[PDB]
């Protein structure tokens, strides 16, 4: 019981509860394999749709285009 | 064998938990109470609850509960440096030692001034909900420390105590019995400050008070005798009981045994255990050496709740 990581966008800590949808896709983890910066799936999808830089301030690499 | 006082063959025919298994109902109730008190989330943290258990078991020199409790305190995020002593402990439990004194040795000096100084404004203050858990914890650990030696169960400390030469005084403002009783007054207060604790304490108290005695020359009279005698040891006097039956219903060997167990539990020996009622079965000597913790806990809780009630009146 120590705090889990948080989205770089929501600043809210992550988590998923381990018909009625118990744990939607938008709340899953997702992270850059070069940065190790992560967040919710939905917020990262929205951020990289209109932008192209690592969501965290002072980070540099272009996270999405590395693999696409 | 778990115990050097009870024969291993007797235990097999009928680490200290397996001993209490010969009674099903009370084993279940005690395990429920222990689970709620020490494991479930509540007003205090788990590390603090284990430390409280440690300080309440390091009062009768029970080198069985001052063990596993410190062995599971470390595995719950606790500070390893704290075990150096109370001098290393934070200035939040230092207010608890003075009341830990009488809750194990001499219950009758508790009063409003003690709880008030505990609930005093400053840089380290308790609330009601977070000290009522503490006192219930202390009473539970004292009762377990008494019972473990009451069965003589086979599996540093002096740096954890303040003035460790206190002891229990014989006795002679007595406590009148049916002036502040659990079933009417105290239950409401404990339930209001602690709902689940009150119900579990209630179930424990009636479960222990429904056990039979079998071998007897009407298995209720000796129960009442062994139930009220320990109470008048502490200061609560029931006026209705005729106290000739107390001496006329319990052998002096039984009396010295129960006093040795409930006052100075480190003083019991195998000769002390066997010197009373050799013609019986060990569960009969267990159901008697096992109700004394319940009577002790009842008296301690009644005294503490009388102390706390006056603080609001």
């Amino acid at each position: 019981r120590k705090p889990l990581p948080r989205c770089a966008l929501c600043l809210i800590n992550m988590g998923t509860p381990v018909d009625k949808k118990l744990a939607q896709f938008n709340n899953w983890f997702t992270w850059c394999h070069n940065c190790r910066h992560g967040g919710h799936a939905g917020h990262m999808l929205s951020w990289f749709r209109d932008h192209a830089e690592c969501p965290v301030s002072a980070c540099t690499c272009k996270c999405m285009q590395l693999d696409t | 064998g778990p115990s050097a006082f009870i024969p291993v063959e007797e235990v097999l025919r009928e680490n200290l938990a397996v001993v209490m298994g010969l009674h099903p109902d009370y084993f279940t109730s005690f395990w429920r109470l222990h689970y709620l008190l020490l494991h479930t989330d509540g007003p205090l943290a788990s590390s603090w609850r284990h430390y409280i258990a440690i300080m309440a078991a390091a009062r009768h020199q029970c080198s069985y509960l001052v063990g596993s409790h410190m062995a599971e305190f470390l595995q719950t995020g606790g500070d390893p440096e704290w075990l150096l002593g109370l001098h290393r402990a934070p200035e939040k439990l230092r207010k608890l030692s003075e009341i830990n004194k009488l809750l194990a040795h001499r219950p009758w000096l508790i009063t409003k001034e003690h709880i008030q100084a505990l609930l005093k404004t400053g840089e380290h203050t308790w609330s009601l909900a977070e000290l009522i858990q503490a006192l219930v914890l202390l009473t539970h650990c004292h009762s377990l420390s008494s019972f473990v030696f009451g069965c003589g169960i086979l599996p540093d400390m002096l740096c954890f105590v303040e003035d460790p030469t206190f002891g229990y005084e014989d006795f002679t403002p007595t406590f009148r019995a049916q002036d502040y009783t659990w079933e009417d007054h105290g239950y409401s207060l404990i339930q209001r400050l602690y709902p689940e604790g009150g119900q579990l304490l209630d179930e424990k108290f009636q479960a222990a008070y429904s056990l039979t005695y079998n071998t007897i020359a009407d298995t209720s009279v000796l129960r009442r005798a062994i139930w009220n005698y320990i109470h008048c040891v502490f200061g609560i006097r029931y006026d209705d009981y005729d106290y000739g039956e107390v001496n006329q219903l319990l052998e002096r060997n039984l009396k010295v045994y129960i006093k040795t167990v409930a006052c100075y539990p480190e003083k019991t020996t195998r000769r002390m255990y066997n010197l009373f009622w050799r013609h019986f079965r060990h569960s009969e000597k267990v159901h008697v050496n096992l109700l004394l913790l319940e009577a002790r806990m009842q008296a301690a809780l009644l005294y503490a709740l009388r102390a706390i009630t006056r603080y609001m009146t």
């Binding site: 019981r1 705090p3 600043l11 809210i12 509860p17 009625k20 118990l22 | 989330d41 509540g42 007003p43 205090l44 943290a45 404004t121 203050t125 609330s127 009601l128 909900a129 977070e130 209001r192 400050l193 609001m312």
Partner: protein
């Protein structure tokens, strides 16, 4: 403006309604000893989601906490207590703690601003107000009591100051209710004193003598002073400018609105904090705004 009547399905007077952080949820309470939560839908409809019983006395003010800590509520009632109810995942609300320290009924409970952690303040009818704190954020059951203040008079309302700057120390306003004909002030200001780590006496509104029934601080958003509101038999708005012990203040009076011809019960500000709202015994809601020259005037009457 239009209205949409909602079937309360309560058994007694509704006391308060409070809105979620994101504006999509709202919570209700009543003297029928219950709390209900309503969420808006796609077609702008309101429907119930939870109707569980909370206390055993008349349930007064119910508040929401910031969703950074989760979906955690709070309440006070005739039972001299205070709860920190939380919703967990169908979903249902489960209790977490019960602060039982006051000898008299707890009147109001208000969460602190985010920038000072998770805190909770409760005012008691006998005149004692107390601040709590939960340093272990992830388990809302280790609540501790940090400060205790004596108000020498009955307490009816409480309001935090949302100023997020580090040039403003935290401060809390206390609303009295005693009607005894002995004059004396009602509203008082308590200001944190981080030098000594205690709440002090900062200012006292001497011009207030009639019973105070609700209080509120205006959201700041960038303002360099403080704006206060008071729900007396009239509606008053105060302005407090700190001069560069506690800080010394300058207390001015801006509005002396008396077109309710009744007793004003509640006051509520906006998010940007430029328009005020209030309701009185007459029965309608008024809105007040500034005419860009420190000259407030009514801008609507909703009934």
């Amino acid at each position: 403006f239009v209205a949409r009547s909602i079937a309360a399905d309560h058994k007694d007077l509704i006391h308060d309604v409070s809105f979620d952080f994101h504006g999509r949820r709202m919570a209700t309470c009543s003297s029928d000893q219950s709390v209900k939560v309503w969420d808006k839908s796609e077609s702008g409809d309101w429907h119930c989601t939870a109707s569980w019983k909370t206390h055993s006395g008349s349930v007064w003010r119910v508040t929401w906490a910031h969703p950074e800590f989760g979906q955690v509520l709070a309440s006070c009632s005739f039972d001299r207590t205070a709860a920190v109810w939380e919703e967990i995942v169908q979903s249902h609300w489960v209790k977490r703690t019960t602060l039982v320290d006051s000898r008299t009924s707890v009147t109001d409970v208000k969460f602190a601003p985010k920038h000072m952690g998770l805190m909770l303040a409760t005012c008691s009818a006998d005149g004692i107000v107390r601040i709590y704190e939960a340093p272990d954020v992830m388990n809302l059951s280790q609540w501790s009591l940090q400060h205790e203040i004596s108000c020498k008079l009955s307490c009816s309302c409480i309001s935090w100051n949302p100023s997020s700057s580090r040039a403003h120390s935290p401060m809390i306003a206390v609303g009295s209710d005693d009607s005894s004909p002995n004059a004396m002030a009602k509203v008082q200001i308590f200001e944190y004193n981080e030098n000594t780590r205690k709440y002090a006496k900062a200012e006292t509104l001497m011009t207030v003598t009639d019973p105070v029934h609700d209080i509120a601080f205006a959201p700041n958003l960038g303002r360099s002073f403080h704006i206060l509101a008071i729900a007396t038999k009239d509606v008053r708005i105060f302005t407090l400018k700190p001069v560069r012990g506690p800080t010394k203040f300058e207390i001015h009076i801006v509005a002396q609105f008396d077109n309710h011809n009744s007793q004003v019960w509640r006051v509520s500000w906006n998010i940007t904090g430029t328009v005020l709202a209030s309701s009185g015994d007459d029965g309608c809601v008024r809105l007040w705004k500034a005419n860009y020259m420190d000259n407030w005037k009514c801008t609507g009457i909703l009934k």
